[PDB]
């Protein structure tokens, strides 16, 4: 009974959809679930080739300073969320620093290279680590990736501002790690 | 924009579900759509490990001779229907001969080896051939696979009987090749 009859690490009904949270200067300005496998984060949706879903950054309510930085996105940021995990590719001139499970060690800024793909989260490692965790033999695996967009302001007191931040995760990972907390919640009531 | 952002040969909404047709001695005794990725063709569903969907052969109406042959299926036949195509593995002592797109050339019987996996249909070849076909530069690709189960009857006039036959195809392939015929049908009325 092999090979192609083998069972997968996760059922076929798995939800690898991308949960996005957009943050302007410390405040959450909105959430978006993306069910397509790939998408492009964009300042505004254009006619474009149309090879991908375009995901528009929210309109910033105080309007600026964030709108000045949204206007530098140009082609923006590619994101892929699939059975393998989460991938991103910076297309914009803006520096993007990232924190995610696959990040290298150190404090220093992990910066997304221009025009190059980066795997932020691996479903195979998360799944292996989650199983050891629930067997009490490990720490809980991480699953959230965060992109931090930066802008220079020479002459202000904060010479670099993280004006915009994007948190990303796959739906299935959050679901599995909320099952025990959800039971604890129900017991409080 | 690569690699993982690439576009697939077929949309993500693709229906690779397995369409089964069961035939006892020349008559169709039933049809079954299987939406699981793998399944086991069985005489009757048992408690079993439960690692797969079990698909029961129909109860034969005249009852026999076919029931004698269904009772030799033992563990039966594994089938996998996925984005790669159609795969089968004979678990039964019954000889199964097959006709499908990947069959070798010749008339002679193509027999499924015991405890060994056989790819009957490849979505990559079908898709490449279909495109050339619709461009008028090729013949239409085939997509149906047929398994022929056999039983000896020394002393009858047909010393080998093909009592049971199973036709298999993936839903998407039939759909695409019926689109033009469906238009022709509508024009007749």
Curated annotation (Swiss-Prot), chains A, B:
<protein>
    <recommendedName>
        <fullName>Interferon regulatory factor 9</fullName>
    </recommendedName>
</protein>
<comment type="similarity">
    <text>Belongs to the IRF family.</text>
</comment>
<comment type="subunit">
    <text>Interacts with STAT2 in the cytoplasm. Forms the interferon-stimulated gene factor 3 complex (ISGF3) with the heterodimer STAT1:STAT2; upon stimulation.</text>
</comment>
<comment type="function">
    <text>Transcription factor that plays an essential role in anti-viral immunity. It mediates signaling by type I IFNs (IFN-alpha and IFN-beta). Following type I IFN binding to cell surface receptors, Jak kinases (TYK2 and JAK1) are activated, leading to tyrosine phosphorylation of STAT1 and STAT2. IRF9/ISGF3G associates with the phosphorylated STAT1:STAT2 dimer to form a complex termed ISGF3 transcription factor, that enters the nucleus. ISGF3 binds to the IFN stimulated response element (ISRE) to activate the transcription of interferon stimulated genes, which drive the cell in an antiviral state.</text>
</comment>
């Amino acid at each position: 009974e092999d090979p192609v009859f083998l069972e997968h690490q996760l059922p076929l009904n798995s939800d690898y959809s991308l949960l996005l949270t957009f943050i302007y200067g410390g405040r959450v300005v909105g959430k978006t679930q993306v069910h397509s496998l790939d998408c492009r984060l964009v300042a505004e949706a254009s006619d474009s080739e149309s090879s991908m879903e375009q995901v528009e950054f929210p309109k910033p309510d105080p309007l600026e300073p964030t709108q000045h930085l949204l206007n530098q996105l140009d082609r923006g940021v590619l994101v892929a969320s699939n059975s393998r995990g989460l991938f991103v590719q910076r297309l914009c001139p803006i520096p993007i620093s990232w924190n995610a499970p696959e990040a290298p060690p150190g404090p220093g800024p992990h910066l997304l290279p221009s025009n190059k793909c980066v795997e932020l989260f691996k479903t195979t490692y998360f799944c292996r680590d989650l199983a050891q965790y629930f067997q009490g033999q490990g720490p809980p695996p991480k699953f959230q990736a965060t992109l931090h967009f930066w802008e220079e302001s020479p002459g202000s007191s904060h010479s670099q501002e993280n004006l915009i931040t994007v948190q990303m995760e796959q739906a299935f990972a959050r679901h599995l790690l909320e099952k025990i907390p959800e039971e604890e919640k129900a017991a409080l009531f």
